[PDB]
Structures are given as C-alpha cells and as structure tokens.
C-alpha cells in the first residue's frame, strides 16, 4: 500500500487496501469477529 | 475505403513535404493515377467521407488546412511556443515532427531559450 500510494494509487484499490489492512490488524488482535470470516492457517484451522 | 485511407496518409506526407496548397479529390485521383476508382465510389468518398472527416476544411469547391487542425507556419511557431502566460499549455513532440521538419534541431535550439522537455 505504501509503494502503491508512492506510485499510482487509484481510489477503489486504496479503499480495498485499507479494508484489507483494517481486517488483518483486527484479526491479529482478535480473530473471533462475529460478523466476519476468520483468518485461517493453510491447514484449515483457525488462526490463534 | 482502403483507397481513402491511402489518400489521407499521402495527404499527411504531402503536407509534411510542404505542399499545403488547396486541392480537389479529382486532382488527388489524377496525381495518384487512380481515377478508375469508379464514379460511384468517387462520389461517395467526396460527398460523404471527406465532408464528415473533420481534418479537412471545405472552401467553395476545394479542401484546405489539409491534414488536420493546423496553422502550419513553417513550423516556426515561436510566438505560439511563447504564447504569453498561457505558454502553449503544452506542445507535442509528435505534432512538431508531423508539422514539417524533424523536431530535434528545433528542440536543441528550444532547450537554450526557455523550453523544457518531459518524457510524458
């Protein structure tokens, strides 16, 4: 996202990148998130 | 159809060479020796295509300003390049080359006046 902004950051893609960033930082702190899917490990188990 | 596209390319080339003189379709057929294109096709090209093409200006019975919206003047558009506070707004490398002579010599001169080149 930094390189993306630095370069030619569109708009919808920035909103997408913010939403993806918002998800990853939240799921790092809490992966339970009732209204959202859960970050998973490649094996299938939920991320701890 | 193809013939007309060849006419346009020829017309650009002839303008580049310097022959900005007004002329007619009949004259181009002649000079290209393609008068045998048929009167039906000749007419359709003349009174539909080369009237809907915005690149030529019809004057009385002849076509002017030849290849496109241009002002020509010997590609020495120094005032135009100046253009007070408006400053052209911005000239194109492709248009100056199409205009008459290669740009490079003019650009080199222009680099030592007040002009700057960016790779857009």
């Amino acid at each position: 996202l930094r390189r993306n902004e630095q370069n030619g950051a569109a708009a919808h893609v920035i909103a997408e990148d913010v939403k993806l960033l918002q998800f990853h930082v939240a799921t790092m702190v809490d992966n339970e998130l009732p209204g959202l899917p859960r970050a998973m490990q490649k094996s299938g188990r939920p991320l701890k | 159809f193809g013939v007309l596209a060849k006419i346009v390319n020829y017309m650009k080339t002839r303008h580049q060479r310097g022959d900005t003189h007004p002329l007619t379709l009949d004259e181009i057929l002649d000079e290209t020796q393609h008068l045998d294109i048929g009167l039906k096709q000749k007419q359709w090209l003349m009174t539909e295509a080369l009237v809907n093409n915005p690149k030529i200006e019809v004057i009385d019975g002849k076509y002017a300003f030849k290849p496109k919206y241009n002002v020509r003047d010997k590609k020495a558009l120094l005032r135009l390049l100046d253009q007070h506070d408006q400053r052209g707004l911005g000239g194109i490398l492709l248009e100056d080359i199409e205009e008459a002579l290669p740009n490079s010599q003019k650009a080199v001169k222009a680099l030592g006046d007040q002009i700057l080149f960016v790779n857009r």
Binding site: - | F1, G2, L4, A5, N9, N53, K55
Partner: protein
C-alpha cells in the same frame, strides 16, 4: 496400463500437420496484406488483436507497427484490447 511409444501418436499428428503449411507468412508484401486488411475492416467496425493476427496469418510485430502507424486501440472495459483502422 500405459504403453510407451517415444512420442504421443496425436502429438506426432500435430507434427505431421505443422510440417505442412506454416503460419510464417512472408511479408515482402505489406500493401496487398493491408489492402486485404482494409477489406476486413469493411466487414466489422472493430476487431480483437488475436483474431486480427489470425485472419492475416502473419507475424505480430509488423502489424502492430502498422496499427501504430494508422490505427488506434481501445479497451472496451473488457480488459482485452480492441483496434480500429479508421483514419479519423
């Protein structure tokens, strides 16, 4: 379960067909291929580059330069690029 034959029959068939006529159209032509290409553009308003090479059976770089000389390009929001040869 599977017999070894040094190469697939049908692959060999692909070779047999390939080894007769090639798409390597020699272009010391330019004009007649182009005269044909105008004729093609009389058939439809726009064409895709993959078919445009396909209908001309020829190398892409010279045609691309032709499309660079007289033609234009347009992404109709279909990702894939589409071209026109109108000098307008």
């Amino acid at each position: 379960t599977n017999y070894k034959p040094v190469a697939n029959h049908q692959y060999n068939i692909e070779y047999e067909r390939k080894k007769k006529e090639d798409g390597k159209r020699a272009r010391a032509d330019k004009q007649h291929v182009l005269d044909m290409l105008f004729s093609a553009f009389e058939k439809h308003q726009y064409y895709n580059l993959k078919d445009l090479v396909d209908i001309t059976k020829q190398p892409v770089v010279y045609l691309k330069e032709i499309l660079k000389e007289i033609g234009v390009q347009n992404v109709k929001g279909i990702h894939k690029n589409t071209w026109e040869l109108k000098p307008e």
